[PDB]
Design a protein around this ligand. Structure first.
Ligand code: ZC3
Length: 342
């Protein structure tokens, strides 16, 4: 009937209660997030005298374990910052409370998804896209520190939170899906819309898959809609093929899952499988962003910094991130030196 003396529920989740005090310290305000791991509560730390976000992990061995891998990666990253000038969310401390591992983060505001909804999925300026773009890019440069070399492995608008509701500073959150570069253990990784070509094709992946996820994240922020909104891996891949073409032959010949989406004709070349979709590479990104037509749906026409010039710098950068070959796909360091950030 009852679980953990009344503090948990069916799902192994702590029952949050308006007003409750923990350890004569954290005045628990309200529930602000929810997922597989457990629940995120808003709370007032009375000692440091501030708001804090607390990530309450479910009372289960499986979630606690993945949560202790998170604590490991956060604490690691945190000691290569100390200033906090690389846009990763800060872990302040962590304690056990009623058999729940709670991770205490700095309090942040809306995530980039809530902002899209705040536009009605019509998106934000290129000037604001650029500021997420620079920050997000500096975070991949940070992660890519060889002793870190951490793959976030599930970047999306709603894993990117604004520090303040009146500033454009951003922070990446949630490192429970993350792991350090290693031999290939896992394959069903990344949220589907932002799933790399290499993942979908079952090839080996590196930090570059985070760059793909940025490329599609960056475009959806300006249009207001996913670039590649797949209902299923087949339909995900087909939408990428619309925009970028068939993947290079030397990549498909390597892929263990090449035949889930394409078929090797007798001659060596590859073509799609009939299942709707524009012919391969005919849904040109130059058009989706409205480079020569006043931006996404003509809504940016006239606005400063939204010229044809401004838009092509944006395009070419987006094309290097959505590069099919994981080794030539642009890296954080040279991405920061692209003209788009002049
Ligand atoms: C969402 C997750 O995995 N961790 C965190 N999620 C949040 C959400 C907030 F509004 C503030 C801080 C954090 S930390």
């Amino acid at each position: 009937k009852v679980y953990n003396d009344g503090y948990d529920d069916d799902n192994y989740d702590y029952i949050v209660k308006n007003g409750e005090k923990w350890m004569d310290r954290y005045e628990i305000d309200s529930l602000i997030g929810k997922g597989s791991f457990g629940q995120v509560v808003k709370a007032y730390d009375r000692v440091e005298q501030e708001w804090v976000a607390i990530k309450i992990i479910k009372n289960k061995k499986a979630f606690l374990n993945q949560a202790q891998i998170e604590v490991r990666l956060l604490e690691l990253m945190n000691k290569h910052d100390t200033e906090m000038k690389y846009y990763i969310v800060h872990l302040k401390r962590h304690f056990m409370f009623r058999n729940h591992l709670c991770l205490v983060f700095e309090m942040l505001s809306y995530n980039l998804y809530d902002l899209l909804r705040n536009t009605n999925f019509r998106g934000v300026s290129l000037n604001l896209t650029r500021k997420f773009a620079q920050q997000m890019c500096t975070a991949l440069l940070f992660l890519a520190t060889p002793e870190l070399s951490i793959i976030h492995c599930d970047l999306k608008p709603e894993n990117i939170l604004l520090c303040n509701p009146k500033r454009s500073a951003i922070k990446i959150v949630d490192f429970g899906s993350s792991c350090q570069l290693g031999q290939r253990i896992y394959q069903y990784i990344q949220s589907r819309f932002y799933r790399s070509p290499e993942v979908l094709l079952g090839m080996p992946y590196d930090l570059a898959i985070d760059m793909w996820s940025l490329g599609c994240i960056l475009v959806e922020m300006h249009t207001g809609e996913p670039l590649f909104s797949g209902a299923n891996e087949v339909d995900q891949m087909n939408k990428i093929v619309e925009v970028l073409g068939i993947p290079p032959a030397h990549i498909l010949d390597q892929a263990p899952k090449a035949r889930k989406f394409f078929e090797k004709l007798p001659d060596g070349t590859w073509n799609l499988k009939k299942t709707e979709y524009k012919p391969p590479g005919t849904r040109k990104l130059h058009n989706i962003l409205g480079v020569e037509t006043g931006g996404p749906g003509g809504r940016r026409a006239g606005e400063s910094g939204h010229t044809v010039a401004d838009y092509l710098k944006f395009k070419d950068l987006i094309l290097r991130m959505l590069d099919y070959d994981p080794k030539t796909r642009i890296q954080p360091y040279y991405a920061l030196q692209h003209s788009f950030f002049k």
